[PDB]
Symmetry: C2
Subunit: 110 residues, 2 copies
């Protein structure tokens, strides 16, 4: 088995015309698993993932903080302990309006 501390993984800052103030850690990656992968995202205060979509589903668990979820229309702010299923091709994004870091686990198929 692989049994490791998530926060020991080196984060990558993500910075594009559509993403700001976000770090990503790959926990269980393509070389480790046969079917789906596990990542941990940290959203800084003011960070933003603009609405977008991919052709695969996402499964998310909110680990820390008040995550604002951008939906195909509108938004909803949720807290640690919420889970999210995002359909294939469903437009969605995220924002952190609070003064502390938000963390969420994200899993996607290979």
């Amino acid at each position: 088995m692989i049994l490791k501390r998530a926060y020991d993984v080196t984060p990558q800052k993500i910075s594009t015309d559509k993403v700001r103030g976000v770090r990503k850690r790959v926990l269980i990656g393509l070389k480790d698993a046969p079917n789906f992968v596990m990542r941990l995202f940290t959203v800084e205060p003011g960070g933003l993932i603009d609405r977008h979509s991919h052709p695969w589903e996402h499964e998310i668990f909110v680990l820390k903080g008040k995550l604002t979820v951008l939906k195909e229309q509108g938004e909803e702010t949720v807290e640690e302990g919420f889970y999210i299923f995002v359909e294939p091709n469903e437009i969605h994004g995220f924002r952190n309006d609070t003064d502390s870091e938000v963390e969420f686990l994200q899993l996607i198929p290979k």
Copy 2:
């Protein structure tokens, strides 16, 4: 999307000749997702999942507490923030030696 509180899901107590003091919540189940599912397990103080295996892999994230992981040989106690990849057919189990509930997220393929 599905956006819901994990702890609002009704738990099921699991009680067999190999499992004691464990509750299970299905968060994203077979009818919701195309490729893999997400469950949340709560291990009571003294709870125990005996060593066993399944022919699919598991991906686990420790949400709360000091989870003791039973390996194919021996054991290791780990804390919130650890992740686990369990290989197909790998013998493994879990125990809670502490005085408070332990929680972990578990995902498996369909």
